[PDB]
Amino acid sequence: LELPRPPHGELQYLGQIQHILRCGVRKDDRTGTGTLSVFGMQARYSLRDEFPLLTTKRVFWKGVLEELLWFIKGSTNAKELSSKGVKGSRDFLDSLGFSTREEGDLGPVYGFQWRHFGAEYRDMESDYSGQGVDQLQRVIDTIKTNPDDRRIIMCAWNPRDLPLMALPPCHALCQFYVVNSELSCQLYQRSGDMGLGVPFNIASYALLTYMIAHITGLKPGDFIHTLGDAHIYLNHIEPLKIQLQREPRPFPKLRILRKVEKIDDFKAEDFQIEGYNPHPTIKM
């Protein structure tokens, strides 16, 4: 000053979709584009011996993993992520100069807030080591020093908000929780695009929880996803109605293939999804 920014567990997601379709009210987003919206939702996904990669459509796991690793790096260079695209809308692009945004320099945004919160920015690929609050390392350090702590929290901001106002609110708050050698994670997002963003975000924060648990010597516990404005875009209603007709398949497993000691040391090759049997891809 996304991402970001016993019954099968996926039945929660499908029930939430069905609830929004039935009971959601018309509400416009910042661009005047229509959604059906309910305020206040929550779902709990076990991370114990399974990984909540949704099965009622094929979720883009490769991009989940690559984007998370980019965020962990604290990168503000869009070209270091050139195997897909991040965050509608890009109105925050209007705040940037001519030369700097042509290079793929995004200014102090995204993972820069996870690794270097509040540091004075200069350019991408300058040395920010020891500058700002490292929220991610702080979470890991707190897990190791005081696992009972109720303040193990990291936030992410939509880059569009940073030059808008003083003390801008975050988009997502992630709280961790440790008991009996298990690490759980609760993600609160002020808004969630249920068709496109939500399945991606479940995978992203479940992956983060696996990574943090690995390096802290803990077992993954639960992932709890909590929303403010939970919404379905109007143009997604028909595909979602079809996805609701599909029966979830057992969740896959996530294996970490190497002993990794530091969060910065994970590479995409360290991870293997096993037994993933999704229904076909849905374009939204």
Added chain:
Amino acid sequence: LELPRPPHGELQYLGQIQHILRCGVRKDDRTGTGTLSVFGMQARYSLRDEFPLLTTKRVFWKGVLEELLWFIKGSTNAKELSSKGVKGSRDFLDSLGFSTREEGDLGPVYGFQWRHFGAEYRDMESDYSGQGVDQLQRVIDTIKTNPDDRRIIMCAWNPRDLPLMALPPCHALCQFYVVNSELSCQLYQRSGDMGLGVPFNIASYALLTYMIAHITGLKPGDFIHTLGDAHIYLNHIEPLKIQLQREPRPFPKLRILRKVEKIDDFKAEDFQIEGYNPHPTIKM
């Protein structure tokens, strides 16, 4: 850089208590005092033509109202609230000087963060007008200028955390939401003392929502209460087991007795609880 820091709706609260009693795990708090704990809970209370003042014990409404008005004032003078006591623990008292804490000067704490976030402190009863971010007025202003906004958020900090670290995390995040001329509120707390704090906090934020809705010309909608570490103190188990045996009575109504234009103008006399028929008080 608490507070803070169709089936009857109260059946959610009682079910959450029962769940923690049955399935919660032993976890210590910062003082090494034992709790039973579950991570991730949510409950929804309708504010439409009723007010969620719990009925399975008498909730201290007078103190809910007086403490909220004190917070809205941005007061850091403990004596301006001398009809009860705020926030265990008071370890943050160790950060204060001799003369200043004898006067009831608490430093930049509590409502000071709601009305004057980030302003340089001097002493209580000095003029902070126009200093820092006024989070509460900002919420009200955003409701009036852009009711679709997904960023209508105000945070509260435990005063103990403010001198502990850079960028300390909040204790509670309150998000508002407007659709169809109704104002809803979601309160996320990183931890909730289910026996003592939680019923008080439901009343406090439901009251806040009534007040904000009054001055913005909207009808109260839902109050959604979301927790991180939801816990029951061990010494409260027996009284809670008894409270679970009680059948909720219909919620009371809350009447605002005057047209009030500005948030700072509300007085305790403007409010009237009607039809409140609680079970008897439980000391915890």
